[PDB]
Amino acid sequence: MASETFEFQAEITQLMSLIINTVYSNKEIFLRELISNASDALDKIRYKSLSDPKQLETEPDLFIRITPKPEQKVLEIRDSGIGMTKAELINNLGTIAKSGTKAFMEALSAGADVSMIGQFGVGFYSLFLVADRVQVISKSNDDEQYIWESNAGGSFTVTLDEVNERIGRGTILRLFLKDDQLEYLEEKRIKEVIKRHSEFVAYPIQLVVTKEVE
Numbered sequence: 001m002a003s004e005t006f007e008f009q010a011e012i013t014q015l016m017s018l019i020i021n022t023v024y025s026n027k028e029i030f031l032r033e034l035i036s037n038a039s040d041a042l043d044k045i046r047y048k049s050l051s052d053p054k055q056l057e058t059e060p061d062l063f064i065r066i067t068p069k070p071e072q073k074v075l076e077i078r079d080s081g082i083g084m085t086k087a088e089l090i091n092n093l094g095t096i097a098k099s100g101t102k103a104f105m106e107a108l109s110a111g112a113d114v115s116m117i118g119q120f121g122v123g124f125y126s127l128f129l130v131a132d133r134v135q136v137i138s139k140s141n142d143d144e145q146y147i148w149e150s151n152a153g154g155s156f157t158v159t160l161d162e163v164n165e166r167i168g169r170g171t172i173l174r175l176f177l178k179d180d181q182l183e184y185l186e187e188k189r190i191k192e193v194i195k196r197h198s199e200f201v202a203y204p205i206q207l208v209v210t211k212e213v214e
Ligand SMILES: O=C1CCCCC/C=C/CCOC(=O)c2c(O)cc(O)c(Cl)c2C1
Pocket: 034, 036, 037, 038, 040, 041, 042, 044, 079, 081, 082, 083, 084, 092, 124, 170, 171, 173
């Protein structure tokens, strides 16, 4: 419907502007960070299900799925984890977080690997190494499906989702890739990045491949 607009906490803006603009070389690290977050969200629904198995029924399969959408210059990273309510999207992604965000920027001013970002709990924002815009589409068992959208630029929107496929339960990160980062639409490239840095994941990592017949 109508979107609601929110202001990012200043430190999150600071972190994002730095990441979207950085000339840091090893931009592929974004995928390990998002796979790690997906795995963590799956751990949470699995754990919750130990005492409330009905929570799994909205999506009984536990998976991470990567879907390139070349025409739209989009890469989607989906999980069937715990998901986020409207309030959780606003909370987890924009208006609070803090969270080692300041400490990570300080570690950068001193020379840390950008690749250390996950150790500060803010690996999500590494997506701006390869994307200039993101939609986070999420469905918690506790709320309706919502879309959080950011272009790294100070404000974000949250909208009740009347436009995307229903996700049973979980989260899609829909990355709108930069024009010079379209290699991450390629099956060969995605496979190599996954295999090298995400070796001990307990859930299947599914790659959606679209190919012409004959
Ligand atoms: O806050 C988040 C991650 C926090 C660190 C991982 C712990 C999991 C928390 C559950 C809620 O997180 C999510 O659903 C979730 C996800 O599935 C994939 C993502 O890429 C992101 Cl950014 C999130 C949001």
